[PDB]
Amino acid sequence: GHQQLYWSHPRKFGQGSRSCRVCSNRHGLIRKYGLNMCRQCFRQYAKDIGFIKLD
Amino acid sequence: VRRACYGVLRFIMESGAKGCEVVVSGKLRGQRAKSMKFVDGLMIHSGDPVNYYVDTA
Amino acid sequence: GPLQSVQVFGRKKTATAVAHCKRGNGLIKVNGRPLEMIEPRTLQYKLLEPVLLLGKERFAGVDIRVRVKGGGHVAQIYAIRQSISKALVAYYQKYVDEASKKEIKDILIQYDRTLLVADPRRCESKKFGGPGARARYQKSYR
Amino acid sequence: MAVQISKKRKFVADGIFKAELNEFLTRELAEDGYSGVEVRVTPTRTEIIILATRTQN
Amino acid sequence: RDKLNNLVLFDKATYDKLCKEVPNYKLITPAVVSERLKIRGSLARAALQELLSKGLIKLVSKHRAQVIYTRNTKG
Amino acid sequence: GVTVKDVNQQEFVRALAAFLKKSGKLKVPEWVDTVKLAKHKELAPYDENWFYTRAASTARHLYLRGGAGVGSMTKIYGGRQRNGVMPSHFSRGSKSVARRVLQALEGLKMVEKDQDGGRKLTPQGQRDLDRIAGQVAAAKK
Amino acid sequence: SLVIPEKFQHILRVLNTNIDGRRKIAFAITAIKGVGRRYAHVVLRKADIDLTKRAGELTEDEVERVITIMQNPRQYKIPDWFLNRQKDVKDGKYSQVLANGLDNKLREDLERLKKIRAHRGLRHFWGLRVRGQHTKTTGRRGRT
Amino acid sequence: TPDIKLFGKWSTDDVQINDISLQDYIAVKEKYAKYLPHSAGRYAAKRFRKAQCPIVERLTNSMMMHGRNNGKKLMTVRIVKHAFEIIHLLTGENPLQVLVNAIINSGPREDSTRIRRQAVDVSPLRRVNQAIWLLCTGAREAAFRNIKTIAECLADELINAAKGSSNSYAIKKKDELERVAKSNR
Amino acid sequence: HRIRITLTSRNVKSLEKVCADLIRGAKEKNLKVKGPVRMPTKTLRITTRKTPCGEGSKTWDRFQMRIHKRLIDLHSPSEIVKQITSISIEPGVEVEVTIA
Amino acid sequence: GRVRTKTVKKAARVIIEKYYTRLGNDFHTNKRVCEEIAIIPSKKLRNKIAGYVTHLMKRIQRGPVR
RNA sequence: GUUAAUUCCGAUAACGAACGAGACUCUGGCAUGCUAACUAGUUACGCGACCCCGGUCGGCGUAACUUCUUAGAGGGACAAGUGGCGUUCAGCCACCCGAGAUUGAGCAAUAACAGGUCUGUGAUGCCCUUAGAUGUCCGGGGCUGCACGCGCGCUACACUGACUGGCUCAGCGUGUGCCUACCCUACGCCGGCAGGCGCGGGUAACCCGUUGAACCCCAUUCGUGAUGGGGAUCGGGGAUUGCAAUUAUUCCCCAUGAACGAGGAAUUCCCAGUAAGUGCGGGUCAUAAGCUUGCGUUGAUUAAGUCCCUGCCCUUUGUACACA
Ligand SMILES: [Mg+2]
Ligand SMILES: [Mg+2]
Ligand SMILES: [Mg+2]
Ligand SMILES: [Mg+2]
Ligand SMILES: [Mg+2]
Ligand SMILES: [Mg+2]
Ligand SMILES: [Mg+2]
Ligand SMILES: [Mg+2]
Ligand SMILES: [Mg+2]
Ligand SMILES: [Mg+2]
Ligand SMILES: [Mg+2]
Ligand SMILES: [Mg+2]
Structure with a gap:
């Protein structure tokens, strides 16, 4: 049926399973320290998180 | 746009600021992207004091 | 009776070597083994340099134990080289007269500044856009 | 805590908490004069002060 | 163009020449012996080790890259 | 007397290899003569009794520091992994060869398994190591 | 020993392939196809051979023993993982094949791929990279 | 030996520098001779601090070249030591004196440059640098693709340069540069 | 008796003020206190x-985030530690009180 | 180049104009004097101002300053 | 005139100013002094083990202390002292004392490009489509295709090297997840290896881990031969990840053993712990480093200058250019 083909592909791995938590896109994801967000929004919200370019 | 930037700048100079910089970018008086810039007062740009001496929006 | 313990560190780029002088006989050992077996053996006379410059009479009354960590081979060798000399200078400053300390300091300085003064040169940070600190990647026109 | 998260992930999660908080209140309190937030995380109580201009609004 | 056809083992004349002239050389090292006698370097090293076993040459400083031998003492 | 640290180690491991040649009861495995000692090595060793020499090296490493299991043995016997067209990296050694070395040194009492994991060295092995240290000292004197 | 002995073979002849007697035995066997450095050292170790000797000093009954050990790996205690025809398709026997049957079984494997008409056999017939290589930038010196 | 210094087994004294032009720029006598040609560094900080570096250390530093050998100073200390052994066992003199004579003979007194090329006489420090480069380049060219080792080649090049028999590559390039500068002046 | 306060903070001088205030509180309440043990910071x-x-x-x-962790051992019952940690806390410092 | 800027030089001239009696020849004395009398936020700027104070005091002991 | 600098001195129809540079922040080093420490240790003791009173132990436990450990407040260096040059001003060079007498990065002004991004956005105007969809889901393929050319890189052309054993030293770091299904691994057996099977430790100065990393050092084998250099291509087999590897995902074993003998015109990057050699972490990662970003080891040649080329910044000059 349609219920057995709509969301039956395995999403246990890969970059298509995870996404950004702002853009929900699947490119340039920062998975380090559980950020799980793209580098553009990381540059956007690094001041709000606490990251700062000291050196 | 001009009167609104004049009003915002006059209000913040009435409140009391060391200096300001109002940049309105976009399409004005036509299709070509014209960017207006209103600067007066003491305003610093470079160095570590830009982190905690100015407020940027 | 009184313990004449002198603990003096010596630093290269990363290697830190702490020498320890006491009252005793003329034996010098580094990490539980003497100076005659510290590889590479090409820098054996470099290890023997304070003994060869000062004679066995100065080192006869001092026993030196050195604990070493960090760096590479030449770094640890030059670290213990600096550290045993600085430890002997500090021991002769603390427990005997300052004139012999000044003469031994003159003998060490007239040979090499590295025996007493550490080198402040350390590794420069690598920058983005290059395989090293100063070098860049190969720029390709056209 | 039973999940036992590390401090490396915990301060990052608090930063993303403050970021999503600031963005949500920027989108929602925009017409009312939003100016910021300040969150004091105490044990068993979470004080979270909206800093804004028009308190009646 | 050029090819070095060195001897893998001793000829009789080359062995007599190594017994005659090589303990009279000031440089007794296997590369120089191989260059002068057109033999292998390993063959030269085994030859100098057996000359050490016989007792006609004097060791100066041996090493994993190069061993150094010279003549016997003069007096 | 003397310890093994006053002794030059390069001839000391060969002297303990000669001591294991003199003893001859380590119960060597059957696959000694044909195996390659690591995944990063390319050939078999030139020496026919590499097992005794590496057991000597294992004895002096466990004398210097104990609690070294099979992972630490592969760490001390790792090396360059020449990947050919790719750049080289560090590669750990073979596990089973040092495992058989530790089983031989547990068979004849030179090492003993210690609590909280690892192999330490027994006082009988310390006695044998200091006796052969005195032997190499008397040889170099 | 150090001089040239009697009956010194400058070139040995084993399995229609010349062997340089100047070269050391564990490397002089490597001129034969199907045997390399590792399997040569395994054969010389499983036989009672001083491997310091050259390939001209050793005797003819002993090189016949070397030939029998190289032709029969299983019967002289060599494991199955030193072999280049582990679990063959046609007969299923762990064996070491030397310098003519190697090319024969290679062209028979190419003929089997040609018969089954696989993509692997098609890339072999075309003369291209079959293990999945990128032929866009490399492989130009072979084709003109 | 606390008073007099021994370069390995070699004496500091009895090293006569023939050229008085190369007296200060050859740092070999009574202050700069050490136990090993290895050292810590700092000689490349100031301009004329390179002249105070000892000449055996300068040969040790200039020997390590061509990619695969950059940063093997213990290894080229071994090379220079065995080369001094071969120099003593061939010539029968002081290897330090042979090296000083090799620098004096191999150093070109003039060169030519663009001010058409005009010839000018070079600085003595530049002459020492050119000699150290040329004899090292000749030794490496003799050692590349050869049975003769690098210590034997460096010993033969230093002995041929101290002799001046025109069989050394350094002496040949010195004569070539001197002849070109004699021509275009 | 042996109660361990772990102070984790991003800012430096605020964390120094908090640990110095805990030292002054232990000195006023008269208990055996250990010095503020610094951990190696995380970048x-x-x-x-x-x-x-x-x-x-x-x-x-190069986005950097430096975090710092100090620890203070106290020889005091639980109510004293709760009374000290209840008073004068600022948002930059996270406090973890381990009983054992 | 170790060239002093105007924020060093004018502030040092104001310091010497207001506190000529307190300042002296020794760098480590009049550096602490300038630290006491002037609110300087950073040690490097403080050292620059104190050094230019010492140099102008040498100029004053040599002769008149414009 | 001076400076890395529109940096200052000084002249002066200019005066008073402002951004930038500088100043600032972080990093690197020096403080046998202050604060600290059972998630770092030190040295003394008490035992234990071994060798002939003494030596070793990262074997155990405790007695003061912080030298080594880490991180906080401070301090220290400023052309300050001397000798010269210089309007005796701005400043420049050398030297003594000394850990430094130019450590490195971040930030970075006015004005602009019709430079890149609508394929980062639930930033977006307009246009197109909107159910037989350019929306969304599933299966397979492709993004890897190969007569050709270019660019960034890796491997090398060997004897200053390769192979085989022995010795011996690091620092950045990271590590069990909101959805999320995927962590670092000690140790004991099975197997040659890739790996597999069980007990543990670790949310991290606790465990991996004293991070037993390579280059290098020592000792054999090789002998100038496209050779034991080099490992491209290709056959046979064995394992892990995943629902699924065929167009070989990767890894391991045997075998096959190509060009390449230091590279033409042309051209890149760099001057001190620098280039280069060399290995280790993060990102992409279920499986995964020839890339990139950081770190550590060994560690130099030559230069302290110039506008010759390529360009840049001031002043004057000329212009028939001003999308210059
Ligand atoms: Mg500014
Ligand atoms: Mg700035
Ligand atoms: Mg290793
Ligand atoms: Mg050669
Ligand atoms: Mg455009
Ligand atoms: Mg699809
Ligand atoms: Mg692509
Ligand atoms: Mg091409
Ligand atoms: Mg090879
Ligand atoms: Mg080959
Ligand atoms: Mg990439
Ligand atoms: Mg005109």
Whole structure:
């Protein structure tokens, strides 16, 4: 049926399973320290998180 | 746009600021992207004091 | 009776070597083994340099134990080289007269500044856009 | 805590908490004069002060 | 163009020449012996080790890259 | 007397290899003569009794520091992994060869398994190591 | 020993392939196809051979023993993982094949791929990279 | 030996520098001779601090070249030591004196440059640098693709340069540069 | 009796003020106190591209986040530790009180 | 180049104009004097101002300053 | 005139100013002094083990202390002292004392490009489509295709090297997840290896881990031969990840053993712990480093200058250019 083909592909791995938590896109994801967000929004919200370019 | 930037700048100079910089970018008086810039007062740009001496929006 | 313990560190780029002088006989050992077996053996006379410059009479009354960590081979060798000399200078400053300390300091300085003064040169940070600190990647026109 | 998260992930999660908080209140309190937030995380109580201009609004 | 056809083992004349002239050389090292006698370097090293076993040459400083031998003492 | 640290180690491991040649009861495995000692090595060793020499090296490493299991043995016997067209990296050694070395040194009492994991060295092995240290000292004197 | 002995073979002849007697035995066997450095050292170790000797000093009954050990790996205690025809398709026997049957079984494997008409056999017939290589930038010196 | 210094087994004294032009720029006598040609560094900080570096250390530093050998100073200390052994066992003199004579003979007194090329006489420090480069380049060219080792080649090049028999590559390039500068002046 | 306060903070001088205030509180309440033991700090390093797209010169950011962890051992019952940690806390410092 | 800027030089001239009696020849004395009398936020700027104070005091002991 | 600098001195129809540079922040080093420490240790003791009173132990436990450990407040260096040059001003060079007498990065002004990004966005105007969809889901393929050319890189062309054993030293770091299904691994057996099977430790100065990393050092084998250099291509087999590896995902074993003998015109990057050699972490990662970003080891040649080329910044000059 349609219920057995709509969301039956395995999403246990890969970059298509995870996404950004702002853009929900699947490119340039920062998975380090559980950020799980793209580098553009990381540059956007690094001041709000606490990251700062000291050196 | 001009009167609104004049009003915002006059209000913040009435409140009391060391200096300001109002940049309105976009399409004005036509299709070509014209960017207006209103600067007066003491305003610093470079160095570590830009982190905690100015407020940027 | 009184313990004449002198603990003096010596630093290269990363290697830190702490020498320890006491009252005793003329034996010098580094990490539980003497100076005659510290590889590479090409820098054996470099290890023997304070003994060869000062004679066995100065080192006869001092026993030196050195604990070493960090760096590479030449770094640890030059670290213990600096550290045993600085430890002997500090021991002769603390427990005997300052004139012999000044003469031994003159003998060490007239040979090499590295025996007493550490080198402040350390590794420069690598920058983005290059395989090293100063070098860049190969720029390709056209 | 039973999940036992590390401090490396915990301060990052608090930063993303403050970021999503600031963005949500920027989108929602925009017409009312939003100016910021300040969150004091105490044990068993979470004080979270909206800093804004028009308190009646 | 050029090819070095060195001897893998001793000829009789080359062995007599190594017994005659090589303990009279000031440089007794296997590369120089191989260059002068057109033999292998390993063959030269085994030859100098057996000359050490016989007792006609004097060791100066041996090493994993190069061993150094010279003549016997003069007096 | 003397310890093994006053002794030059390069001839000391060969002297303990000669001591294991003199003893001859380590119960060597059957696959000694044909195996390659690591995944990063390319050939078999030139020496026919590499097992005794590496057991000597294992004895002096466990004398210097104990609690070294099979992972630490592969760490001390790792090396360059020449990947050919790719750049080289560090590669750990073979596990089973040092495992058989530790089983031989547990068979004849030179090492003993210690609590909280690892192999330490027994006082009988310390006695044998200091006796052969005195032997190499008397040889170099 | 150090001089040239009697009956010194400058070139040995084993399995229609010349062997340089100047070269050391564990490397002089490597001129034969199907045997390399590792399997040569395994054969010389499983036989009672001083491997310091050259390939001209050793005797003819002993090189016949070397030939029998190289032709029969299983019967002289060599494991199955030193072999280049582990679990063959046609007969299923762990064996070491030397310098003519190697090319024969290679062209028979190419003929089997040609018969089954696989993509692997098609890339072999075309003369291209079959293990999945990128032929866009490399492989130009072979084709003109 | 606390008073007099021994370069390995070699004496500091009895090293006569023939050229008085190369007296200060050859740092070999009574202050700069050490136990090993290895050292810590700092000689490349100031301009004329390179002249105070000892000449055996300068040969040790200039020997390590061509990619695969950059940063093997213990290894080229071994090379220079065995080369001094071969120099003593061939010539029968002081290897330090042979090296000083090799620098004096191999150093070109003039060169030519663009001010058409005009010839000018070079600085003595530049002459020492050119000699150290040329004899090292000749030794490496003799050692590349050869049975003769690098210590034997460096010993033969230093002995041929101290002799001046025109069989050394350094002496040949010195004569070539001197002849070109004699021509275009 | 042996109660362990762990102080984790991003700012430096605020954490120093908090640990000094805990030292002054222990000195006023008269208990055996250990010194403020510093841990080696952690530098969370992120290196991304400056450009949102990929077309530009190869420029790279260095986003740093330094976190610091001090610890203070107290020889006192639980109510004293709760009374000390209840008073004068500021948002930069996270406090973890271990009983054992 | 170790060239002093105007924020060093004018502030040092104001310090010497207001506190000529307190300042002296020794760098480590009049550096602490300038630290006491002037609110300087950073040690490097403080050292620059104190060094230019010492140099102008040498100029004053040599002769008149414009 | 001076400076890395529109940096200052000084002249002066200019005066008073402002951004930038500088100043600032972080990093690197020096403080046998202050604060600290059972998630770092030190040295003394008490035992234990071994060798002939003494030596070793990262074997155990405790007695003061912080030299080594880490991180906080401070301090220290400023052309300050001397000798010269210089309007005796701005400043420049050398030297003594000394850990430094130019450590490195971040930030970075006005004005602009019709430079890149609508394929980062639930930033977006307009246009197109909107159910037989350019929306969304599933299966397979492709993004890897190969007569050709270019660019960034890796491997090398060997004897200053390769192979085989022995010795011996690091620092950045990271590590069990909101969805999320995927962590670092000690140790004991099975197997040659890739790996597999069980007990543990670790949310991290606790465990991996004293991070037993390479280059290098020592000792054999090789002998100038496209050779034991080099490992491309290709056959046979064995394992892990995943629902699924065929167009070989990767890894391991045997075998096959190509060009390449230091590279033409042309051209890149760099001057001190620098280039280069060399290995280790993060990102992409279920499986995964020839890339990139950081770190550590060994560690130099030559230069302290110039506008010759390529360009840049001031002043004057000329212009028939001003999308210059
Ligand atoms: Mg500014
Ligand atoms: Mg700035
Ligand atoms: Mg190793
Ligand atoms: Mg050669
Ligand atoms: Mg455009
Ligand atoms: Mg699909
Ligand atoms: Mg592509
Ligand atoms: Mg091409
Ligand atoms: Mg090879
Ligand atoms: Mg080959
Ligand atoms: Mg990439
Ligand atoms: Mg005109």
